[model samples]
Target: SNITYVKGNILKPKSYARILIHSCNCNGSWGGGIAYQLALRYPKAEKDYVEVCEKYGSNLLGKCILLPSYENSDLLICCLFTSSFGGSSHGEKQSILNYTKLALDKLKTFREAKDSIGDYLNGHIKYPIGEYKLEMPQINSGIFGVPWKETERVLEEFSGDMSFTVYQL
Candidate 1:
């Protein structure tokens, strides 16, 4: 697998079935950067994400939440909670890398799980991790302010298993 870097808008991906992964804060506020774009695109999914943060708080770090797009069932949004709160960047580079790794690993589990009620879970039987393409912007590079090169290294760590389509403006 090879990671392909594309110079374009991440929101409008070439494949709608692709998963859009991005860094987010534990504060449940999708207030800026790519997270904000996702919020605007999927309000219902954003509501679910907020509720998850309300339940877990800062513990969401090093974890990933998979949400279905309200408009497109084939599409999914992966919220990689890497920061403690909304606004003002503050996080260790190592921690962000570790958290992102965990999130990506967690996402792989979705492909293995089988949904008993397939209606609500459009991707119950669908193998999204390996089947659907994974795509994202330069996560943690925007509001979180982590240097793009540092984050790119973590992304490279998973190059053997996953190939990402990184979008840029």
Candidate 2:
């Protein structure tokens, strides 16, 4: 019943189980745009993300990784691996859409696992995953340069199962 849209800084969200989601590449560079903001906000998680990239390479494109925010127990960051490497471009729209779906599916699984994921995240997470409110900037529409409407259509494909709070600046 709600996929609210608003204009603001994504970092200022008030939800207790706030999830900051963004599109990322497998190359271990959080060097631009939303990724950069996140790198600054979650440095430790950034290191873990880099390790995941180093381990997976192109295998990461169709997957997602969840990392606990180093500075905020209530915040979680989900990086959707949508490209092979990072610079000025990203993967095609279809690939990005595919990875987004996979990421969301994994998130649902993580929510259902509860204690299992808690053990996986160590003590960095304090809230149950089920309580999370997924939030994001207009991913791939900024530095990655994909058209926002295309991404919106991709998000619409998942409308039945999930709703997101989209933040715009």
Candidate 3:
């Protein structure tokens, strides 16, 4: 089998429309890094974000939600979610893993799905000597450990890890 990598935000050319999704944990409110970034970018999203929190409260935590980025529709649309929120569920990462698996399964129904997800996971045979940590992620932890070589996974799964759970610079 052959393997290739997918690099997103690499000076990506403007497209008629693209979609952006972020990880979140509703928790009746949005806080932490990513949410603040979204609050800064789109006031409406921030508003609806707050509204969703008020309406759904903690139940929203760990659920995926789709938000739009109409301002750059010609470039991209954004959706935010939470396979697991930062402080809320790090201890219950198994839940995150389970939900993420379901989410990835749904990705299979998309227009163009591939096998890089499994490949990247399978390819991780070269992982560091001992264990892998499951703490919260830094904004651009891609270059770090979380998934140093996630491009391959993004290419196949149509999903991005660091991209999905990023926060600030």
Candidate 4:
């Protein structure tokens, strides 16, 4: 299996470098769910998210961006722009699922591409992006209103390319 299930909080400290991936909207509002928790815990990362939204807007759909959680050097935040808006106004279930697949694909491509981290972060590649443990909560299930299995099926497609640690609280 490509995903390792863990019963715990996704934000818990880990010894190794980790990439905490989550479903996000291109609108820049991390107002609820795990995203809200992240905004409270890592304000700097939230700012980066807002900046990205301001720069790209809806163009970010089906894409991803890796941002540093300045509070923890070993931890990075991967936002998958799966919708144009969030909350009760999120995109259709199937649409979110599709963008989730595309976003994860972009993430994998970024990880495998040499020196691509700098491209996202304006020429500063601070960490070894590919070496980080890829982890996430049951994304798209809460605010985005998508079934877990739908997103799970998309993830399974990448079984041979990457592995994920999915945390459940």
Candidate 5:
């Protein structure tokens, strides 16, 4: 009930503080699907992601991290570490789903805390995360292989604390 569906590209620039949330693998590869596209467009953010993965490894699973897109002052990239690896080598469906939920909960916590924890790039968060518009594609539905509706159900659990604008392209 808290999700807003919009038809357009998620990568397009927006006027407000916006976060582009997507599912990710902890293996440090943004080699396929939306992750690949993001790598092509926001290489700085991808580098940050790779470094984070290299630092955390599978320990990043079921967690979330937010990275600033230096190329876009108003944009931040949110990674939901839902799988250990991407493509055909990804985790089981239910495990991915569970991690998706856990990662989102962490996102909510990060937003609410708005603290220095998990700060990337310039060593501090430039924008208050709570001020950012949370937006995403139908995460986990592509290369990660979970159904959109199932992920949507997990999002529904956060109806009171957060709302998401889902971009469909």
Candidate 6:
């Protein structure tokens, strides 16, 4: 039941596993919370990240990226494209959603047949990025539309054995 699934400890949840996919096409350096975490885990990964930044420049570097991790087969692939690098700013909201969709659509080719929670995100690039409707601001934030709605529609096309939950970070 859902209750049993929720009874696990923080250190060791009923299943200490998750597939974390995120948007990464943001034209900024990697120093924020999520980037910091990724940097901590893989030093080489950080080197690759920075190299991409240096070569592409934050602007083009600020595009969607996908990284798949393997810790006890607890696959954790991620996308880290953000709209705003810092401050109370925003980027092209549509850009984020489009990137997200592209990344997840790609992930379908990477997984195996098993119990899986397809996709996971810390924030919804969809509507209400931060108490704001996604389809407003004249498409200024790069957000095309709400992620949840579009995600569901996309998932419907994915014929697989998986479940998912999108988080609001």
Q: Provide the overall lDDT of each model, using Cα atoms, as 2-decimal numbers.
A: 0.75, 0.77, 0.37, 0.86, 0.86, 0.38
lDDT order of candidates, best first?
5, 4, 2, 1, 6, 3
What's the CA error at residue 104 for candidate 5, in Å? 0.8
Q: Give candidate 2 regions above 4 Å deviation.
A: 13-15, 115-120
Instruction: Show pairs that collide, candidate 1.
Output: none
Q: Estimate, for each residue in 10-93, the C-alpha lDDT of model 1 and write its tens digit.
A: 887454477788888888899988778778988988997888889888888877887777777667777887878766755777
Answer with 1 or 3, whichever has the higher TM-score: 1
Q: For candidate 2, write residues 1-169 as lDDT tens digits.
A: 3367889988874747787788889999998988888888778989988888888788877677878887887888888888887766667767777777776677666666663123337676677665678889988887666788877877776665667889997
lDDT (tens digit, per residue) of candidate 4 on 14-83: 8888889999998999988899999999998899899889998999989888888888878888899989
lDDT of 5 at 39: 97
Query: Candidate 2: minimum summed lDDT over ten consecutive residues — where?
Result: 111-120
lDDT of 5 by residue, 6-92 (tens): 998887778888888999999999998778889998999999899999998999999998888878878888899989988899999
Write model 6 residue lDDT over 71-139, tens digit each, in one string: 323433444444534223444545555544454454444333221122222222222212210110111
The alpha-carbon lDDT assigned to residue 54 of candidate 3 equals: 61
How much does candidate 6 score in TM-score? 0.46
Q: Which stretches of candidate 4 lie over 4 Å from their true place?
A: 115-127
> Candidate 3's C-alpha lDDT?
0.37
Query: Estimated TM-score per prediction?
Result: 0.85, 0.88, 0.48, 0.92, 0.93, 0.46
Candidate 6, residue 160: Cα displacement in angstroms equals: 5.3
Candidate 5 regions with alpha-carbon error over 4 angstroms: 115-117, 121-124
Candidate maximizing lDDT: 5
- Model 5 scores a TM of 0.93
Give Cα distance to truth, residue 61, candidate 5, Å: 0.5
Tens digits of per-residue lDDT for model 3, 16-120: 333344445544334654445556665665665556656765454434444443344332222223333445343244444444444434433321322111211
Backbone collision tally, model 2: 0
